[PDB]
Amino acid sequence: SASIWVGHRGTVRDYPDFSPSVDAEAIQKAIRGIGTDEKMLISILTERSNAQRQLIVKEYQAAYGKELKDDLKGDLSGHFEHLMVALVTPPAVFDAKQLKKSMKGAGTNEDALIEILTTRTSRQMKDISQAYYTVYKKSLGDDISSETSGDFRKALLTLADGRRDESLKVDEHLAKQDAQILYKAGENRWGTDEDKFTEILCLRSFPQLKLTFDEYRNISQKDIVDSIKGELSGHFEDLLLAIVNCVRNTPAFLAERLHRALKGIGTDEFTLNRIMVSRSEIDLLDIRTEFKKHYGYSLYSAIKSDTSGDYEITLLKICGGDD
Ligand SMILES: [Ca+2]
Ligand SMILES: [Ca+2]
Ligand SMILES: [Ca+2]
Ligand SMILES: [Ca+2]
Ligand SMILES: [Ca+2]
Numbered sequence: 001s002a003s004i005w006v007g008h009r010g011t012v013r014d015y016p017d018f019s020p021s022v023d024a025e026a027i028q029k030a031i032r033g034i035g036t037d038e039k040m041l042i043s044i045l046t047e048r049s050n051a052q053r054q055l056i057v058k059e060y061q062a063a064y065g066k067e068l069k070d071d072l073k074g075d076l077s078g079h080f081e082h083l084m085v086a087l088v089t090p091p092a093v094f095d096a097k098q099l100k101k102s103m104k105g106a107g108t109n110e111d112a113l114i115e116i117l118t119t120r121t122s123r124q125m126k127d128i129s130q131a132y133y134t135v136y137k138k139s140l141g142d143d144i145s146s147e148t149s150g151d152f153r154k155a156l157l158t159l160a161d162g163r164r165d166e167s168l169k170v171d172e173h174l175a176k177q178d179a180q181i182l183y184k185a186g187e188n189r190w191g192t193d194e195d196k197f198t199e200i201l202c203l204r205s206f207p208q209l210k211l212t213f214d215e216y217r218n219i220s221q222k223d224i225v226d227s228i229k230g231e232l233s234g235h236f237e238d239l240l241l242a243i244v245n246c247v248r249n250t251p252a253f254l255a256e257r258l259h260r261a262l263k264g265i266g267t268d269e270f271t272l273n274r275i276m277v278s279r280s281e282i283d284l285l286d287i288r289t290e291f292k293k294h295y296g297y298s299l300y301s302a303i304k305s306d307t308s309g310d311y312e313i314t315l316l317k318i319c320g321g322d323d
Contacts, residue, residue: 004123005091007282011320014049020059031075038310045087046317053088079269079311086277092127103147110235117159118242125162151194151236158202165205179215192231201243209247251286262302276318298323
């Protein structure tokens with residue numbers, strides 16, 4: 001058992017000298033009474049992996065009959081609070097909540113839905129579905145079904161099932177047939193067979209899709225991206241382009257979401273928090289590399305320019321270093 005939630009390029013790793021008891025006691029002393037030692041909280045939680053944080057949570061419950069997340073919510077405020085609670089939340093539960101949050105109210109955050117459902121693996125998606133049910137007592141699919149529609153809805157429902165092929169094997173025969181199908185379902189006909197785009201881009205493994213995009217280019221003499229932009233529109237178009245970019249370079253896709261979250265008028269702290277926390281033990285190092293390659297400046301400096309206080313320090317600790 002390797003964590004489906006832990007990858008090879010994260011910025012946060014297991015603290016080797018970890019002691020749950022010592023950490024829980026330190027956290028308790030830090031929030032206990034008037035004031036809060038935010039510095040102590042930062043020092044500990046950003047320097048422990050999520051798995052260790054879960055052990056601290058368990059220990060804190062045992063020793064104080066208190067839920068660590070509730071004490072954090074009672075003492076902390078703002079972005080710093082949200083970030084800190086995010087850090088102590090199990091990964092599948094964090095994603096499930098982010099998903100609920102993106103569908104909550106009169107509006108839907110299509111970009112957040114796209115981001116999460118396209119970057120999570122089938123295994124993580126199965127975990128997220130289970131967590132969603134546990135926390136909401138409703139399936140993710142039911143919620144998606146009700147807050148979206150059209151082709152966008154159908155593609156999100158296919159991804160939420162976590163049925164994408166996980167095999168390591170590829171089928172050149174299959175890649176050619178699929179590339180022919182995509183060609184025939186789009187460019188080669190008036191209108192588009194949207195369902196066929198959804199089926200192939202959502203159920204074939206990433207490796208398989210990379211072959212299919214090569215064959216497609218051969219058949220059509222155009223990139224799959226060109227076809228998608230010409231045949232589709234709206235959120236559906238955005239979702240399929242997201243799938244293509246993730247197949248080719250997931251860290252660059254996420255580097256781009258971070259970039260938009262930090263630029264313009266007003267930082268999108270929720271996108272920032274989500275990406276920083278959820279990819280910290282997976283590929284934040286690669287996201288850093290891509291961000292710098294694409295924008296010319298490191299993620300570390302982007303954080304430093306648009307954020308401040310304890311919130312900034314925590315993000316910088318998660319970030320891990322400059323590039
Ligand atoms: Ca306090
Ligand atoms: Ca809504
Ligand atoms: Ca067409
Ligand atoms: Ca159609
Ligand atoms: Ca278009």
